[PDB]
Design a binder for this molecule. Structure first.
Ligand code: ATP
Ligand code: ADP
Lengths: 480, 179, 68, 233
C-alpha cells in the first residue's frame, strides 16, 4: 500500500512503528521496511504486525536482521498477510520465511501467491480414514504404527535421533508418495539443511537437471535467523502444504524439523512484545500458537497432509509446556530416549513411551496388534526389573523372569535398524525391512523358539534371517 | 484513575476553591492549543534543556497569553516534577474533570448535515433529562457515515449511545440474516 | 494562541537547535554498565556511538525517547 | 571548591544525592556526606557514586549506617575515588573500609594513599611463574596443591572448616612468606576478628611494641555496617 510508517522504537527483534491514526494495518500484516543496509541504500526487511499498541503504533517482529534500522525509517504496510509464493514454481527451491529463493537459481513467479496466516479448516470437512503406514523402520512400523494422512511426532532429547530418522523417513517415503513433500527447516541447524538438500538432489528427489519436476519443496528458516523468522517458517511450510492439499488435490508429506523452535522463537519475541511470561519461560499463548500450526495439518477430503514433526523435548523435560502441548495434537507420537541411546541402541526410540492411536487392533491387524502388545509388555517387565537387576544381581530373580529378561534384551536390541542415511555413523550398510518381516521376526524372538543366539547377534540387524546369519558369523569369529 | 486525571482533578479543585473556574477552563483551552504544535511540546519535554531556561520561557509564554496565575503555577509544577511529558493528556482530561465538577456533561451529536440550533437545544433537553447535568454542552460533528438522523454519544466518554441513523438499516439487514 | 509570541517561538526553536543536533545527544543516565542517551534519531541498532571522553559504546536498545 | 549538592532521597543504605546541574561526580567518586548523627557532629558517612540517575541526581551507597541523615543536608565530592591509606604506616592496624584504624592506637598518615578503584593490570605484565607452594596440610598439599602467585579459593558450606583452614594457613605461612600479609576479611564474624588479631599479636607477627615491624595489615568489614561497607572491604 502507501501508508508510511516512521518506525518509532527498535527494541531487539521486535520493532514497533507509529502509523498515522486513520491508516493502520491489521494484525499479522506484512510490513516491508524501506531501510538502509550496512553498505548501500536499498534493502527490504519484512515485518508482521503482532499487536496494535494504541498510541498509533503497532508492534511488529522482524523477519530479517534488526541491525541497520533507524528510528524514523519509512515503512509501508502491504495490506496482505505476508503472502508466500506457491504452486508449480515452489517445487525444488529452498525458500525463506519471507517467500524468496535461497538457492540462487532463477527467482520464482508470483502467479499463485498465498497468505501465510489463514483460518483453520472447519470441522465440517475433515477426512478421517484410518490407514496404517509402512515407513521402513522395524520398531516404529511395529511398536508404534504411523497414521497415513495424519500427524506424527519424533519427540526426543537433544541429539538422540529425530533428524537422522527424519532423513531416513524422507529417503524412504519421498520417492513412494506420488504427492510432493514439503520439508520445513524450522530452526534447524544449517549444515543439516545442507546435508538434506544435497541428499535430496542426489537421491533424484530434487532432480537438479529439471528443477520444475521435483517431488520436494523446501523452506529454510534455519537456526541462524531472527526470532521472527523461526516464528513463521513453519507457517510458510504449512502454506505450501495447504496449497498442495487445497488446490492440487494431492496427499503431501511435510517434514517439519524441530517444531520446538516454532515455540522458542515465539518465546523470544513474546518476552519483548509486552506479553507476560508463562510457565518455565515460554510465551503465554504457547498452546494457541502451537495449535495454529498443528491444526492446519489435516486430511481434508481433497487430499491428506501426512506430517512428521521432529519435536524437540527441552533437555528431555517430557513434562515441559512445549512438548506437553504438542502431545495433544500429535497422533502417532514417538518419544526417542537418550537412555536407550547411551547404550548404543539406535534408533533411540523408546519401545514403551512411543505409542500411537493406530495400534488399535481392527485398524492395524490382529496378529500385529498382539505382537506389539507382547513386545511392549516384555519391555515394561524389563523396565520394572531394571531395579532388581542393577542392585541385587541378575541371578536373584526367577528363572522364568530370567527368560523374560533375556527375551526383552533380544527384543530391544532387535528393534535396532541400520539406516541408509546413518551409515556414516554406523560404518555398516543399511537394511530397509518391511512390516510383515519385523512381525515374523518378533514372533520367533518372543515365542521362545530362538532364545539361544547371543545378544550381539540381534544388534543392528535388518531382519531375523540376517540375525541368524550374524549368529553364525559370531560363533565362527569366537573360536577363530 | 490515571496520573493525567489526577493532575486535572488538582487543577479543577483549585478552580473550585478559587473563584476563577470558567476563566480556568478557557485558559486550559488556550493552554492545550499552545501545547499542541509539536515544537513547543518537544521543547518542554526533552530534559537535556536546562530547567531554568524551560521555566523562563514558561514565564514568558504565561505573560504573553495572560493565563490565570494558578494554572501558571500548575504548568510550572508540571515542569518542576519530571511529569511534564504528560501535559497534553493532562490538559485533555481537564475538560472531563472540569465538566464533571461544574455539573456539565458533554453530548456528542453526529448527524449527516448541520443540526439546527432549536432542535439541538431540544436534544439538549433530552440529554439533560436522561443524564441529570446542569448546562449540557452539545459539540456537534458533521459525519457522512449515517443516512438520515442523529447519534447521541452522551455519557462519561462515548459510553452511552442512542441513534436514529444508518444503524436502523444495519440492524434491519443484520437481523434479516437471522442465522 | 501564539501570534505575537513569535520572539518566544524563535527562542524555543533556538534552544531546540542548541540541544537537537544530528547524530548527537546527551547522556541522560549513565548507570553501572549501560548508559541511557537521549536523541540520536539518526542511528541504527548496533551503531558504535562515541562519548567524547574516549569510550565508544554500542546501541542495543532503541527506545522511543532514550537510546539505551 | 568541590561543588557540593544536597542529599534528596534515602533508601536504607543507598542515598540519592541532588547536585547542581553543572557538575556531577564521576562514577565511583566518593561523596563524604557531611552532617550530624548525634548530639555532636561526626561527618563520617562516606558514600560512593554508583550510578547517575540523570537530571543532576546520583545514587550513592553509604559505606556506613545512614541513621541520622535528613533529606536536605549538604554533601561534598572528593573528586577522586574513595582513598585508603597504604604504605608502612598501614602495617599493623585493624582497618575499616573508610581507611581509619579501629584499634584506636595510632592515627595513620594518609600522605601515601591510593584510590580503591583501579583498572585491571594489563595483560603484558603478568607472571610466567607457575610454582607450587607447600601449605602444610596433607589434603590441600597433595590432591589440589596451591599455587604461588595465584588466587586460591577454598569453597564450603557453613559450619565446615571454611575459616579454620584460613586461620591454620595463616599459622603455617605468615612469617615464612616475608611479604606482608593483608588479612582482608569481608563479612567476618568479628569475634573471629578479635581472635585473629590476638593470635597475630601472640604469634609475634604484629608487634605491640613496634607498628612498622608488624608486617600484617588487617582490614575488617565485619558482618554489620550496611552493605556499602561489605561491598568494598
Ligand atoms: N580440625 C578441626 N577440629 C575440630 N573442629 C573443626 C576442625 N575443623 C573445622 N572444625 C569445625 O568447623 C567449624 C567452623 O565452621 P566454618 O569454618 O564453616 O565457619 P565459617 O563460615 O568458615 O566462618 P567465617 O564466616 O568466619 O569464614 C567449627 O565449629 C569447628 O567445630
Ligand atoms: N542409527 C544410528 N547409528 C549410529 N548413530 C546414530 C544413529 N541414529 C542417531 N545416531 C547419532 O545420534 C545423533 C542424533 O541425531 P541428531 O541429528 O543429533 O538429532 P538432533 O537433530 O535432535 O540433534 C546423530 O547425530 C548420530 O550421531
Amino acid at each position: 500500500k502507501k501508508n508510511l510508517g516512521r518506525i518509532a522504537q527498535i527494541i531487539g527483534p521486535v520493532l514497533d512503528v507509529a502509523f498515522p491514526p486513520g491508516k493502520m494495518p491489521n494484525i499479522y500484516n506484512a510490513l516491508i521496511v524501506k531501510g538502509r543496509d550496512t553498505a548501500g541504500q536499498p534493502m527490504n526487511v519484512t515485518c508482521e504486525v503482532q499487536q496494535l499498541l494504541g498510541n498509533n503504533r503497532v508492534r511488529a517482529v522482524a523477519m530479517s536482521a534488526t541491525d541497520g534500522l533507524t528510528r524514523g525509517m519509512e515503512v509501508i504496510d502491504t495490506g496482505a498477510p505476508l503472502s508466500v509464493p506457491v504452486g508449480g514454481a515452489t517445487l525444488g527451491r529452498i525458500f525463506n520465511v519471507l517467500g524468496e529463493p535461497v538457492d540462487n537459481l532463477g527467482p520464482v513467479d508470483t502467479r499463485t501467491t498465498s497468505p501465510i496466516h489463514r483460518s483453520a479448516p472447519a470441522f465440517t470437512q475433515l477426512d478421517t480414514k484410518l490407514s496404517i503406514f509402512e515407513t521402513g523402520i522395524k520398531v516404529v512400523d511395529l511398536l508404534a504404527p504411523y497414521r497415513r494422512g495424519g500427524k506424527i511426532g519424533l519427540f526426543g532429547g537433544a541429539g538422540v535421533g529425530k533428524t537422522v530418522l527424519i532423513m531416513e523417513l524422507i529417503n524412504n517415503i519421498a520417492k513412494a508418495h506420488g504427492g510432493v513433500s514439503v520439508f520445513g527447516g524450522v530452526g534447524e541447524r544449517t549444515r543439516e539443511g545442507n546435508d538434506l538438500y544435497m541428499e535430496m538432489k542426489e537421491s533424484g528427489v530434487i532432480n537438479e537437471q529439471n528443477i520444475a519436476e521435483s517431488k520436494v519443496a523446501l523452506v529454510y528458516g534455519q537456526m541462524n535467523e531472527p526470532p521472527g523468522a523461526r516464528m513463521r517458517v513453519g507457517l510458510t511450510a504449512l502454506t505450501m502444504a495447504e496449497y498442495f492439499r487445497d488446490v492440487n488435490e494431492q496427499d503431501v508429506l511435510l517434514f517439519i524439523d524441530n517444531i520446538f523452535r516454532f515455540v522458542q522463537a515465539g518465546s523470544e519475541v513474546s518476552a519483548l512484545l509486552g506479553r507476560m511470561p508463562s510457565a518455565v519461560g515460554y510465551q503465554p499463548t504457547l498452546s494457541t500458537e502451537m495449535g495454529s500450526l498443528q491444526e492446519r495439518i489435516t486430511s481434508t477430503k481433497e487430499g491428506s497432509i501426512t506430517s512428521i514433526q521432529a519435536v524437540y523435548v527441552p533437555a528431555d523435560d517430557l513434562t515441559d509446556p512445549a512438548p506437553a502441548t504438542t502431545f495433544a495434537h500429535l497422533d502417532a507420537t514417538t518419544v526417542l530416549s537418550r537412555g536407550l541411546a547411551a547404550k548404543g541402541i539406535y534408533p533411540a526410540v523408546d519401545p514403551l513411551d512411543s505409542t500411537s492411536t493406530m495400534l488399535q487392533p481392527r485398524i492395524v491387524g490382529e496378529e500385529h496388534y498382539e505382537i506389539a502388545q507382547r513386545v511392549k509388555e516384555t519391555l515394561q517387565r524389563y523396565k520394572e526389573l531394571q531395579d532388581i537387576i542393577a542392585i541385587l544381581g541378575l541371578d536373584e530373580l526367577s528363572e522364568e523372569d530370567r527368560l523374560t529378561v533375556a527375551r526383552a534384551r533380544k527384543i530391544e536390541r532387535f528393534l535396532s535398524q541400520p539406516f541408509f542415511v546413518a551409515e556414516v555413523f554406523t560404518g555398516s550398510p543399511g537394511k530397509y525391512v518391511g512390516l510383515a518381516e519385523t512381525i515374523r521376526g518378533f514372533q520367533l524372538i518372543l515365542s521362545g523358539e530362538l532364545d539361544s543366539l547371543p545378544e550381539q547377534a540381534f544388534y543392528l540387524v535388518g531382519n531375523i534371517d540376517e540375525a541368524t546369519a550374524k549368529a553364525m558369523n559370531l560363533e565362527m569369529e569366537s573360536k577363530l | 484513575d490515571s496520573t493525567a486525571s489526577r493532575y486535572a482533578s488538582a487543577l479543577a479543585d483549585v478552580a473550585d476553591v478559587t473563584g476563577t473556574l470558567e476563566a480556568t477552563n478557557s485558559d486550559v483551552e488556550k493552554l492545550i492549543r499552545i501545547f499542541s504544535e509539536e515544537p513547543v511540546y518537544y521543547f518542554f519535554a526533552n530534559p537535556v534543556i536546562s530547567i531554568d531556561n524551560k521555566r523562563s520561557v514558561l514565564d514568558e509564554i504565561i505573560t504573553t497569553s495572560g493565563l490565570q496565575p494558578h494554572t501558571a503555577n500548575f504548568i510550572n509544577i508540571l515542569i518542576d516534577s519530571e511529569r511534564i511529558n504528560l501535559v497534553k493528556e493532562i490538559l485533555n482530561e481537564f475538560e472531563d474533570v472540569f465538566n464533571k465538577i461544574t455539573g456539565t456533561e458533554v453530548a456528542v451529536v453526529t448527524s449527516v448535515v448541520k443540526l439546527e440550533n432549536d432542535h439541538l437545544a431540544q436534544i439538549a433537553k433530552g440529554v439533560q433529562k436522561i443524564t441529570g447535568a446542569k448546562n449540557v454542552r452539545i459539540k456537534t460533528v458533521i459525519d457522512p457515515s449515517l443516512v438520515a438522523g442523529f447519534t447521541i454519544r452522551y455519557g462519561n466518554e462515548g459510553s452511552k449511545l442512542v441513534d436514529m441513523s444508518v444503524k436502523k438499516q444495519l440492524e434491519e439487514i443484520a437481523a434479516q440474516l437471522e442465522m | 494562541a501564539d501570534e505575537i509570541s513569535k520572539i518566544i517561538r524563535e527562542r524555543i526553536e533556538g534552544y531546540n537547535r542548541e540541544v537537537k543536533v544530528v547524530n548527537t545527544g546527551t547522556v541522560l543516565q549513565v548507570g553501572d554498565g549501560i548508559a541511557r542517551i537521549h536523541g540520536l534519531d539518526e542511528v541504527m541498532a548496533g551503531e558504535l556511538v562515541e562519548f567524547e571522553e574516549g569510550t565508544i559504546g554500542i546501541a542495543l536498545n532503541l527506545e522511543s525517547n532514550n537510546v539505551g
